Amino acid sequence: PPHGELQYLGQIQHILRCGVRKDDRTGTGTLSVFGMQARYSLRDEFPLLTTKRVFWKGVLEELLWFIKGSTNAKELSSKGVKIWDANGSRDFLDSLGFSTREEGDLGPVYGFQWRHFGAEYRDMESDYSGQGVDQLQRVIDTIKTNPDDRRIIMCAWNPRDLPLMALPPCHALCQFYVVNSELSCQLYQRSGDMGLGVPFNIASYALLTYMIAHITGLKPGDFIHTLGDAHIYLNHIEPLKIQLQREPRPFPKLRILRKVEKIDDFKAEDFQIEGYNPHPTIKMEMAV
Amino acid sequence: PPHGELQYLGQIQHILRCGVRKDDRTGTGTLSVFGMQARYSLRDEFPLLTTKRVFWKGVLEELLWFIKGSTNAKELSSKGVKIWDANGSRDFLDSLGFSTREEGDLGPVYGFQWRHFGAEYRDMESDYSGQGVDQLQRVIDTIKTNPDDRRIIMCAWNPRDLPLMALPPCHALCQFYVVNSELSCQLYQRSGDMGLGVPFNIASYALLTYMIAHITGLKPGDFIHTLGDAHIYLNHIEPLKIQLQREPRPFPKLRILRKVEKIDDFKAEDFQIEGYNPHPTIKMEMAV
Ligand SMILES: Cc1nc(=O)c2cc(CN(C)c3ccc(C(=O)N[C@@H](CCC(=O)O)C(=O)O)s3)ccc2[nH]1
Ligand SMILES: Cc1nc(=O)c2cc(CN(C)c3ccc(C(=O)N[C@@H](CCC(=O)O)C(=O)O)s3)ccc2[nH]1
Ligand SMILES: *c1cc(=O)[nH]c(=O)n1[C@H]1C[C@H](O)[C@@H](COP(=O)(O)O)O1
Ligand SMILES: *c1cc(=O)[nH]c(=O)n1[C@H]1C[C@H](O)[C@@H](COP(=O)(O)O)O1
Numbered sequence: 001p002p003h004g005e006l007q008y009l010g011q012i013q014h015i016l017r018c019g020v021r022k023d024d025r026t027g028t029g030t031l032s033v034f035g036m037q038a039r040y041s042l043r044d045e046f047p048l049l050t051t052k053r054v055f056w057k058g059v060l061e062e063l064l065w066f067i068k069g070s071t072n073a074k075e076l077s078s079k080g081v082k083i084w085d086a087n088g089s090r091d092f093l094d095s096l097g098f099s100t101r102e103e104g105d106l107g108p109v110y111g112f113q114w115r116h117f118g119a120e121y122r123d124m125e126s127d128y129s130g131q132g133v134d135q136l137q138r139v140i141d142t143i144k145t146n147p148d149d150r151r152i153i154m155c156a157w158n159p160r161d162l163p164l165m166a167l168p169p170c171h172a173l174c175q176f177y178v179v180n181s182e183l184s185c186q187l188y189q190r191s192g193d194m195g196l197g198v199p200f201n202i203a204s205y206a207l208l209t210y211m212i213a214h215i216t217g218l219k220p221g222d223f224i225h226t227l228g229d230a231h232i233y234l235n236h237i238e239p240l241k242i243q244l245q246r247e248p249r250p251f252p253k254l255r256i257l258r259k260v261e262k263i264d265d266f267k268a269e270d271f272q273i274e275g276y277n278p279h280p281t282i283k284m285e286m287a288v
Numbered sequence: 289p290p291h292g293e294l295q296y297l298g299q300i301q302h303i304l305r306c307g308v309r310k311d312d313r314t315g316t317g318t319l320s321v322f323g324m325q326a327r328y329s330l331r332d333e334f335p336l337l338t339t340k341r342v343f344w345k346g347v348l349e350e351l352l353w354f355i356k357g358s359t360n361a362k363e364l365s366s367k368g369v370k371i372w373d374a375n376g377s378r379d380f381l382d383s384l385g386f387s388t389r390e391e392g393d394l395g396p397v398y399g400f401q402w403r404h405f406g407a408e409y410r411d412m413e414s415d416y417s418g419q420g421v422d423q424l425q426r427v428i429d430t431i432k433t434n435p436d437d438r439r440i441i442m443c444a445w446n447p448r449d450l451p452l453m454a455l456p457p458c459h460a461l462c463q464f465y466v467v468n469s470e471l472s473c474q475l476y477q478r479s480g481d482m483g484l485g486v487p488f489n490i491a492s493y494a495l496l497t498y499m500i501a502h503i504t505g506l507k508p509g510d511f512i513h514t515l516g517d518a519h520i521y522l523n524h525i526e527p528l529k530i531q532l533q534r535e536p537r538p539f540p541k542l543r544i545l546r547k548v549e550k551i552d553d554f555k556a557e558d559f560q561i562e563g564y565n566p567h568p569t570i571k572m573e574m575a576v
Contacts, residue, residue, distance in 0.1 A: 025436070034465040034467070034472050034509075035325065035474050036325075148311050151456045157461070159406060159423060160405070172441060172461060173476070175460075177516065179310050179320060179322070186322065188461070188514070190441060222323065226325065229463075
């Protein structure tokens with residue numbers, strides 16, 4: 001079969017060639033296409049793009065960070081991953097009307113929604129243990145007791161909390177699916193920065209599926225990536241054209257070195273990416 | 289000029305050919321595939337399937353019923369559309385442990401979530417005016433003022449309310465998009481009964497897009513249908529095979545018979561499907 005990475009490269013080709021110029025919140029301007037989907041096999045291979053070196057350390061730490069239910073950019077930043085620090089800045093928080101909010105407090109985003117959906121948000125320092133719906137655990141439990149369930153959904157998009165977010169989730173929800181001992185996951189990404197966030201986001205959900213398959217005794221199946229506003233920022237056009245001239249390389253594999261029982265038990269050292277031979281890193285300037 | 293209906297027919301082919309046997313909640317059994325996407329153009333045509341006659345009256349009536357904010361099956365039944373009566377019957381309600389609920393009360397379903405997301409659900413007769421988030425109107429307001437917004441989402445999936453729903457929404461959420469004066473809509477349907485619900489569902493959202501496009505002064509663009517568990521029930525394989533032998537006929541057109549100002553203003557007589565010439569109707573027994 002063909003290299004799964006060609007789907008992503010193909011989506012980049014399409015947007016660059018046929019995407020429509022669409023202004024945006026950041027003011028950078030974009031080339032956009034509405035509605036896209038790709039299927040990444042998770043069977044004996046891991047979808048970490050090769051046409052560009054993907055910041056894997058960032059992916060792994062962000063997910064563990066999400067899993068802990070943290071909304072403090074400081075805690076992830078202490079791991080050497082600064083991807084969310086800009087959004088927790090004093091200046092940025094103020095530009096949204098969050099002047100009384102401490103620096104690093106991203107609001108009730110991902111982690112908070114996944115583990116405490118519906119809980120009354122105070123601040124990043126608050127203890128929400130036992131508050132709200134722990135969707136992640138409910139998803140894990142359902143997969144174990146009734147794998148045929150067609151309602152295995154973890155939703156980050158919370159209408160009543162959007163006002164408190166420094167940035168509404170680019171990932172509204174994801175759905176899990178089990179058939180013949182294989183676990184699949186589909187992500188609905190309402191908005192996708194193709195050159196920066198997407199490659200990262202793909203690896204992230206592929207990792208989450210591996211983690212959940214591991215503790216549920218299942219084999220990773222497919223990761224389906226569904227996009228809403230799939231866009232390429234104007235300043236990413238040139239670097240993306242360089243990346244398109246690169247031939248994909250066999251996807252690496254992901255090894256889980258230890259037998260884990262609970263999702264909260266995983267640690268960075270538990271994972272190992274082997275056979276990852278990517279082309280040189282390509283810098284995509286952040287939009288703001 | 290590939291006919292738009294070929295996508296739905298191709299999805300049926302794929303599932304019959306590659307779908308995997310998967311038991312289900314109803315005990316009927318299905319052929320299943322996880323993750324699918326189809327794009328139905330809404331430009332000078334309406335995607336009402338022709339390889340079988342679709343119950344358009346039901347489609348229109350159900351959507352007007354959603355907009356009214358109703359969660360009472362009887363209010364739709366009184367229009368001659370009985371699609372939700374079973375899910376509101378005494379026996380079915382009792383089977384889910386809702387014996388204290390009145391017959392016809394579907395719980396916090398679409399009507400409620402769309403117009404009062406977050407509000408505390410009491411019963412189908414309660415007045416929720418001013419309670420919760422009226423996502424529908426907010427969506428309309430944003431389309432009219434900031435069309436580039438990548439967060440135009442209407443969510444029906446509410447983790448907090450699920451334990452009260454007679455049937456968790458098969459349509460988790462939808463996202464709207466605007467470019468070149470065209471309004472597009474993507475639906476994330478977590479579970480799709482390909483033979484029964486899907487054809488109907490596709491018409492439902494195409495209609496919603498036509499409605500919003502009308503009140504916002506935009507032209508309908510694309511309707512992207514995204515599926516989670518796309519399945520063909522076993523007792524639908526024979527009739528679907530017959531349907532697949534039928535050549536689609538040009539899609540009809542949808543006419544709005546007068547300038548409507550507000551979404552709540554639409555009445556059934558404001559719409560006319562013209563040039564609809566479907567093949568004979570194909571009954572698809574309900575599963576359970
Ligand atoms: C416009 C915009 N696009 C984004 O993709 C985006 C992403 C995040 C958060 N996030 C989920 C991120 C994932 C990956 C990131 C990133 O900057 N990656 C660089 C790595 C450079 C480095 O830190 O060493 C890269 O992949 O090149 S940032 C926050 C705001 C955003 N804003
Ligand atoms: C297993 C199952 N599949 C469904 O598609 C489904 C749909 C609803 C509600 N819904 C959203 C529906 C949309 C269309 C419907 C339907 O029965 N359509 C028939 C029409 C027969 C008639 O004319 O009355 C059809 O299209 O053949 S039902 C409730 C439970 C379900 N249960
Ligand atoms: C958000 C977060 C993420 O994990 N990955 C992403 O791709 N993004 C991107 C999408 C978009 O360019 C921007 C968020 O902006 P908006 O809310 O869509 O306006 O970050
Ligand atoms: C639900 C409602 C709708 O509008 N469209 C649909 O196709 N369905 C289908 C999907 C599934 O076969 C069943 C609902 O069951 P479940 O909750 O997925 O188990 O009806």
